[PDB]
Amino acid sequence: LLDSGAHFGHQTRRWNPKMKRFIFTDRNGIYIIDLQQTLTYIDKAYEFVKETVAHGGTVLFVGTKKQAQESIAEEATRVGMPYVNQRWLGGMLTNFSTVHKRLQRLKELEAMEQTGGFEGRTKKEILMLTREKNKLERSLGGIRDMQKVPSAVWVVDTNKEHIAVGEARKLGIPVIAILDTNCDPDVVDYPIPGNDDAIRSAALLTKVIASAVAEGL
RNA sequence: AGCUCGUGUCGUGAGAUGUUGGGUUAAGUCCCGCAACGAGCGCAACCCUUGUCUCAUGUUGCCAGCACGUUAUGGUGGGG
Numbered sequence: 558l559l560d561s562g563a564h565f566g567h568q569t570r571r572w573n574p575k576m577k578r579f580i581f582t583d584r585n586g587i588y589i590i591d592l593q594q595t596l597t598y599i600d601k602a603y604e605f606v607k608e609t610v611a612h613g614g615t616v617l618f619v620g621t622k623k624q625a626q627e628s629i630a631e632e633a634t635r636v637g638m639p640y641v642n643q644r645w646l647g648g649m650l651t652n653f654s655t656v657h658k659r660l661q662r663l664k665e666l667e668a669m670e671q672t673g674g675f676e677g678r679t680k681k682e683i684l685m686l687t688r689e690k691n692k693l694e695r696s697l698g699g700i701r702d703m704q705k706v707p708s709a710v711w712v713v714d715t716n717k718e719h720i721a722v723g724e725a726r727k728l729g730i731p732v733i734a735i736l737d738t739n740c741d742p743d744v745v746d747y748p749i750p751g752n753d754d755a756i757r758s759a760a761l762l763t764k765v766i767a768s769a770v771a772e773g774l
Numbered sequence: 775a776g777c778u779c780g781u782g783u784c785g786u787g788a789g790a791u792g793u794u795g796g797g798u799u800a801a802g803u804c805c806c807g808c809a810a811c812g813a814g815c816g817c818a819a820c821c822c823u824u825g826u827c828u829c830a831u832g833u834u835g836c837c838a839g840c841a842c843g844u845u846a847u848g849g850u851g852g853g854g
Contacts, residue, residue, distance in 0.1 A: 644807095644808090645809095646809085646810070646811060647782080647783075647808090647809030647810040647811080648781080648782045648783070648809065648810055648811060649811090651781085651782050651783075652781055652782050652783095652810085652811060652812095654781080655780085655781055655782075655811060655812070656811065656812090658811090658812075659811080659812085679819085681819090720783090720809060720810090723783090723809095724782095724783095724809095727783095
């Protein structure tokens, strides 16, 4: 993980005092996250993913920054797991019943596509239904799979997606987050300190969780 | 072209957000964003009339091609 730069962080300016525990040193104006804590935390995150998926649980993959979008998307597709990549509608978890209606519309609309209802109405209407189709499918890619609720939530760069962490906290589901040197440790249960600005560093974390769930599945 | 609601979120509370920002339109019309996701009444469309053409259509309506006309003209037989 050192090859990717899991020791990299943010500037000393943008740092958070509550991050001093796992700070190793500061070079060239950036903080170096100590990797020993990263290992002794990722093992715990691994065992937790194992014990939750093996006991009939699920985790929801959270990532929105373009550095870790395709990585999490492909990982979830290869493990068949709920995930969000494009944008998080504020209230996926709290307004679960409300956002289920969007999925029901997607399903009934795919049924309409199968039955071919594209000429029984005006051209403007069918064009608008096609626009709604692609809009709802791009906005909801890994969402057609949550029946009840996510049992755990895995996020990358919690500062960017703070609404997701706030929601998951509100409903109390555990959050597993890789926290950078600017991050907040009190909101995450299972930190895995390390860089989230690098595509490679964030990707190889998703692989680790992928392996944990895959053998846990 | 605006007025609201359900759930969510923020606030002790009155309330706020959605409905704000950039662009665009006749328009809260639409797009991109966005702690909001949707919905309703509005906007728009569906209705009438008008402008073009096709099929059907010949009376009390036309008369182009034929006949009778008396001036008084489709007036009359007939003709689409």
